[PDB]
Amino acid sequence: QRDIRSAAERATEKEKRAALVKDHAVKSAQVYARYYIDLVESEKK
Amino acid sequence: MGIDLKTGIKKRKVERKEPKSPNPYIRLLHNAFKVVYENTGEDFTKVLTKRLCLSKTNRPVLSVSRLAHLMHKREDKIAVVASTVTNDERLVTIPRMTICALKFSATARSRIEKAGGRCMSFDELLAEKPTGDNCVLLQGRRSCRAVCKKFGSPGRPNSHVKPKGEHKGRRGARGRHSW
Amino acid sequence: PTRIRKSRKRRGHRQMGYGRVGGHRKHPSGRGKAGGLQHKRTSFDKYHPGYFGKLGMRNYHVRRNIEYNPTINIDKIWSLIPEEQRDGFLQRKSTTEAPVVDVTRFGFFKVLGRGSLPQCPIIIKARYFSSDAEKKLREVGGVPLLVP
Amino acid sequence: LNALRIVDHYVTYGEPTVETIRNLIYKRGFAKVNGQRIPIVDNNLIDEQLSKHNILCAE
Amino acid sequence: PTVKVFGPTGTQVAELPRPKVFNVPLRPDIINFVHTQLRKCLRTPYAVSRYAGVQCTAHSWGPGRAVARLPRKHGGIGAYANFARGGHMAHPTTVIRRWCRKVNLNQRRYAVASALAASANAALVEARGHRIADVPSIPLVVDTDNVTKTKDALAIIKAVGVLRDVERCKDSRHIRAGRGKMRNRRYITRKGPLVIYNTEDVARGFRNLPGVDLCHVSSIRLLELAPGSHPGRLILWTKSAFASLDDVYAAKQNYTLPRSCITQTDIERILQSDAVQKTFVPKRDPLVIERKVDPFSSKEALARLDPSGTVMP
Amino acid sequence: AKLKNHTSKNQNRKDHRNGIKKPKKSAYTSHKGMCPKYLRNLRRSRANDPRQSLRPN
RNA sequence: CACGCGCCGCGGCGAGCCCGAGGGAGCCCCCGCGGCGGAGCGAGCGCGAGACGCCCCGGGCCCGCCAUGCCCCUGCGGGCG
Ligand SMILES: [K+]
Ligand SMILES: [Mg+2]
Ligand SMILES: [Mg+2]
Ligand SMILES: [Mg+2]
Ligand SMILES: [Mg+2]
Ligand SMILES: [Mg+2]
Ligand SMILES: [Mg+2]
Ligand code: NA
Structure with missing residues (x-):
């Protein structure tokens, strides 16, 4: 590759x-920290 | 240590990278064109360096008549050959063309000088058109050697080659039921 | 030169590249070409068809200079004329001063018909011609002749 | 899955957590670039090699 | 392209043009090949006697006497075998060995022309062993007329500033090492200048100077142009020899001198020109490679991977 | 003195050493055993087609 | 080590190439035939190649050997397929 x-x-x-x-x-x-926390909480609910 | 390296992998291949000839001219040309390719990445130069590394058995000669026949729709381009250009006496007249070769026969050189053509060296090609602008790369027929025509097994039903010596009998030489 | 030979690089190895189980013996298969139809039948059949037997008639003494018969193709004819005369003759497509070529003087007997000819009349003298050689010559304006 | 079952007695496997994945990539992560094994120590390399798939950093 | 001519006292007197033989390409490989072949064509043959080791009567005792199975003489002395004292050679040397080698005429001519062209290079003449600091020009051409006294030859040699090479050889005579000193090769000296003449009498004057060799211009020897296979030798030309060499090559019927070609110095001039430079295109910057370290060891290393600093360790 | 008569013990390993070679890509289109009337018609149809005939002029 | 055969690499020249024996009073300089290559096939009498192609493979055409149909001169000869 030539620049x-x-x-x-x-x-x-x-x-x-x-x-x-x-x-x-x-x-x-x-964003992803929020996503992981939400995943766990939703599964429990 | 302790690793598997022979399951989806093949043996290495050997290819030429240097001209192998004692002639210093060919070494100089190969190194110069390798430098040019290093600094531009052009395909013409890559093929040229590869060709300059080939052995003599892989660089057949080219005639003036064949060159004329190959430049029918491109008379203004430059023919580049990495071999010697020989003469063809069977051709009475030749046109005007520009050719760059490793060598020229005295007769081929004189015939080209007459008719108004130009015989060029690879040094001048490097000086003027390092990347081969307006250039055509040509070669001879690599299967024209007499040795090439005797490869194989003459006595097998499906081969089409002749035996090497002189044979005077008939057993196996007069059809499929001569044995 | 012996310095660069492969045999000098085997000193210290005991059997010199011939193996331990087999070894280097004198004539383990015989001398010369013996065995061609017996234990060397596969080799002879693969590479030498027509080696055994007879074929054709025999001549007890061949006369070598009677069978001699050189040939020239119609496309090599103009190369026998030197270049200056070559351009002179080509320029004037003369019918009264056509070039005359006697191939017997150059060492040829028969004229064959491979290739083509320049479009210009010419006279060619030989001892024999091929069917096509005569046809191509007459289509360019030339005529063939028989010379003693 | 069927190939894994065929090679079962040579391997062990399971489902990983986010923490395991992060530790593996941060502590033992190397990249295959042009057939070389290049260490991963910053997000510039990931961005340069995987930007066309919307992958711009370790996260 | 002119050549200066000097007189017997060292002053220029005339002028000549350069003969075309001095434009031939320099090919060390061809010179080496031809030197090897020609030098092998001069040997004398040798071999052992065909009767050596086989004039006795010897026969093997069999097994059963507690001795090895080789042939023995009547008293029991071993004989014949190459590992026995007094036996024959395993493969005795023979005179039917090929002593000479064949070289095509064209390649012999090429080699001599290339060696001549090397002799006019100055740099090569210095690289070979020659003391030419005081020499006016190369080629060196001298108008000597006829010289029959060694004193006059020495006078000329001093005049043209070539005396240091003659003294180099005159002081180097010594006795050779090893065998050979008893085979009629006792003494060794270095190589001096070479004199090439034509229709002149200089041989008697120059014969006895140590290190000097003489040659007629119509039959130049390659083993003298490249001693030891090294091409650049210092040559003293007489005027007539130079003028005749102008056309000694025109008497080689149907022979063309090989075409001149470019050298190493002429290549980088081409490669450094603008015409070739216009095609160069820079290559992208290379990859950056650093050693692997544990990000959790320090906060700077961790920040290099997660700027937010949200990873607990 | 008897020796072994037969074994195929190592033969499958030797076959796979350089892979199993496939046939050439020209063996699939040979005319080696085709019906002659079909072959003759194919020749004449090509020669009379101006767009694919190799006859000169 | 000598000679012969096969293939590979390198040098010179290139439709050509070639220190044969030998002769010129120059181990190394000058001159110097065959031969091999250039056209094949056919037991032989004999006949005898162009149409395409960067290279390679394959098709398509052409020459010789074998067999056939039509035309015709100088005719168990010629031409066309
Ligand atoms: K003794
Ligand atoms: Mg031992
Ligand atoms: Mg054995
Ligand atoms: Mg043994
Ligand atoms: Mg002894
Ligand atoms: Mg000692
Ligand atoms: Mg067995
Ligand atoms: Na082809």
Whole structure:
């Protein structure tokens, strides 16, 4: 795989991608903790 | 240690990666085209380096008449051959064309120089068209050797090859019921 | 040279690549081609059909220079003319100054008909022709002749 | 299931919990990338290799 | 492409053009192959006597006497076998061995031309053993007329600044190691310059200088151009020899000198040009690889995997 | 002095060593034993078809 | 180790190629025939190849051997299938 873009563009896009990933991680962690708790409670009910 | 590695796996294969010839010209050309391919990933260059690694038995010669017949719908392109170009006296007249080869016969070279054509070396091809823009890659017939025609078992019913020596008898040589 | 031979790399091994159970003995199958119809029948039948028996009539003394008979195809004829005369003759498709070729002077007896000819009249002298060779020659304007 | 039953006497199996799965991936997780065994220590690798299936982190 | 000519005192006097034989490609492999074959064609044969070890009367005793089964002489001495003292060779050497080798004429001509082309390279002449710091030019051409006294030859040699190579050889005479010193090969000296002449009398003047060899221009020997199979040898040309070499190759009927080709230095010039550079396209950044560590060991490692920090351990 | 007469003990393992080779992909379309009248008609129909005839001009 | 046969790698030249014996007073320089290759098949009298193709496989056509139908000159000979 051959990339046409320069080094600085790669660096900036890499930083943007990292930030996006971090935010998604936080959101998903919260959502899935809620989901597991809810599953257990609903089965008991 | 202690692992199974022979259940869904086959033995390794051996392929040529270097020209194997003492001629320094061929080593230089192979290394240069390998560098060019490393820095561009183009398919023309990959096939060219592979061809430059082939052995002599796998690089049949090409005639001027065959080259002419192969350039019928593409007279403006450049013919690239990784072998020697020989002459064909059976052809009285030849057109104008551009050919890049490893070697030319003196007669083939002179015939091409007349008629206004151009004989090119791989060094000049690398200098001008490293990625082979407007280029056609051609080869000869690999099954034309006389050795190739004697592979197999002559005495079996379903083979179509001849025995190697000289045979003077009749047993098994005059049909399916000669035995 | 003996430095690079495979046999020199077996010193220290006892039997030199011939095995322990079998070993290297003198003539374990016989001498020469013996056994062709007996214990070597499979080998002879697979690779040498027509090795045993007779076939055809016999000549007690072949006359070697009577059977000699070189041939040339009609597509090799123009290569006998040198290049300068070649272009000269091709340019003028003359019917009164046609080139005359005598293949016997070049070492050929019969003319065969493989290939094609340039479109230009020519006279060819030989001792024999094939059926098609004459047909192709007359369709290009030439004529065949018989030479002593 | 039928293949597992055929190989039964060589394996043991069962149903895992979320905690087991998380511990396995965090402590003993490696990725197959181009036939190499690459350690998993951050979410960038997962995102780079599995983004096209909407998988962006360990969670 | 011109060549300077010098006089007997070291001053330029004339000028000649470069003969085409000096543009041939350098092929060490071909020179080596031809040197090997030609040098094997000069040996004299040797072999043992066909009667050696088989002039006695010896027959095997059988089993039953508590001795090995090889042939014995009347007193009981072992005989004949190659492991017996006095026996014959297992496979005695014979004179019907193939002593010579065949080389095609075209390849012999190629080898001599390539060695000549190597002799005009300076760098190769230095890589081979030759002291040519004080030499004006390569090729070295000298107008010597006729030389019959060794003193005058030495005068010329000093004039053209080649004396250090003659003294290199004159001081290196010594006695050879091992056997061979008793086989008429007692003394060894190094190799000096080579003189090529034509219609001139220089042999008598140059014969007795140690390390020097002479050759007529119409019959140059390959074993002298590449001693030990190493091609670059220092050559002194007379003017007539150079001028004639101009066309000694035109008398080889129906022979064409091999075509010149490019060398190593000419390749990176092509590869570093812009025309080839325009096609280069950068490759993506490589994969990042780090050692595996336990995330729960430290909070930084854990944060690398779960930024929220919601994992109890 | 008697020796063994027969065993097939190791033969199945030797067969599977390099897999079981499949036939060539040209053995399925050979004309080796087809009815001659059908083969002759196929030849003539192709030759007279302008769009698939290999006759020159 | 010598000679013969098969296949593989490398060098030179390439529809060509070739230090045969030998001769020129130059171990290494110059000149130097056969031969092999280039057309096959057929017991033989004999007849004798182009239509397609980066390469490989396969089809399709063409030559020789065997058998047949139609036409015709110079005729148990020629041509077409
Ligand atoms: K003795
Ligand atoms: Mg031992
Ligand atoms: Mg045995
Ligand atoms: Mg034994
Ligand atoms: Mg002795
Ligand atoms: Mg000692
Ligand atoms: Mg048994
Ligand atoms: Na084909």
